[PDB]
Paper text:
α-synuclein misfolding and aggregation into fibrils is a common feature of α-synucleinopathies, such as Parkinson’s disease, in which α-synuclein fibrils are a characteristic hallmark of neuronal inclusions called Lewy bodies. Here we present cryo-electron microscopy structures of six α-synuclein fibrils in complex with lipids, revealing specific lipid-fibril interactions.
The L2A fibril is composed of three identical L2 protofilaments related by a C3 symmetry. Interestingly, the three protofilaments are separated by ~20 Å and thus show no direct protein-protein contacts. A striking feature of the L2A fibril is the bridging of lipid molecules that span the ~20 Å gap between the protofilaments. The simulations revealed that lipids interact with the segment 33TKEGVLYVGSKTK45, bridging the gap between the protofilaments. In detail, the acyl chains bind to Y39, V40, and G41, which form a small hydrophobic patch at the fibril surface. Additionally, the lipid head groups interact with K43 and K45 on one protofilament and with K34 on the neighboring protofilament. In the L2A fibril, lipid-mediated interactions seem to be essential as they connect the neighboring protofilaments. While micelle-like lipid arrangements at the fibril surface can potentially also result from diffusion of lipid molecules after fibril formation, lipids in the central cavity of L2A seem less likely to originate from this process, as lipids mediate the interaction between the protofilaments, suggesting the presence of lipids already during fibril assembly.
Author numbering:
A (entry chain B), B (entry chain C), C (entry chain D), D (entry chain E), E (entry chain A): 14 to 24, 33 to 96
The structure:
Amino acid sequence: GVVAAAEKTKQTKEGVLYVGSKTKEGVVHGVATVAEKTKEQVTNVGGAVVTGVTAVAQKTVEGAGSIAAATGFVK
Amino acid sequence: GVVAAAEKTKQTKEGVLYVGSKTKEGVVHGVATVAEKTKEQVTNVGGAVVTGVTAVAQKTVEGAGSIAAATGFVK
Amino acid sequence: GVVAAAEKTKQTKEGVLYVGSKTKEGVVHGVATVAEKTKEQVTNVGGAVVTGVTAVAQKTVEGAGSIAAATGFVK
Amino acid sequence: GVVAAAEKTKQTKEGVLYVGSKTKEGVVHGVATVAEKTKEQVTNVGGAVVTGVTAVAQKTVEGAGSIAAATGFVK
Amino acid sequence: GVVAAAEKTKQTKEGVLYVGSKTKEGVVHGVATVAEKTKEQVTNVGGAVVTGVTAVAQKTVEGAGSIAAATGFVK
């Protein structure tokens, strides 16, 4: 029942990017799931995750983008 | 029952980006799920997560973007 | 029953961005879910999360954007 | 029953952004869910979350944006 | 029941990128799942994860992109 459908039917400076970064110390951890003495952990990450000292996300979804996620359990 | 549908049907400086970043110390953790002595944890992250000392998100969803998420459990 | 539908049907400086950032110390944690001695935690994050010392979000949803989320449990 | 639908049907300086930030110390936590000795926590965050020492959100929803969220439990 | 379908039916400077990065120390961890004395951990990461001291994501989804994910267990 977890359905993700994406359809795209298609019948000057555009999207131009300039980044200049100067970093001395950089610690980036991105997507992280840490468990200590944990019993029962469920984690889900979906989509676009842009992370860091200089993070730029230009025009992430120009067409069709669908994210379906059923996260959990049954007892 | 967790359905995400996206449809895009398509029949000068546009979206131009300039970033200049100068950082000495940078610690970025992004998406994180930490559990200590935890029993039963459910986490869900969806979409666009732009994070960091200099975070820029230009024109994230130009077309169709759908995020469906059922997060949880049954007992 | 958690349905997210997005449809986009399409039949000078536009969206131009300038960021200049100068940071000495930067700590960014973004999306975080922390549990200590917790029993039973349900978390859900959806959409666009732009975070950081210099956070810029330009024209996040130009088209169709839908976020559906059922977060919780049954006993 | 948690339905989010978005439709966009489409048949000089526009949206131009300038940010200049100069920060010495910056701590940004974004979206956070912290539980200590907690039993039973349900959290949901949806939409656009722009956070940080310099946070700018220009023209977040130019088209169609829908956020549906059923957050809670049944006993 | 975990179905992801993507269809794309198709019948000046465009998408041009400039990055200049100068880093002295950089620690990047990307996607990480750490468990210590943990019992029972389920993790799922899907989509585009761009991470690092200088992270740039230009035009991530120009066509059709669908991410379906059922993350969890049954007892």
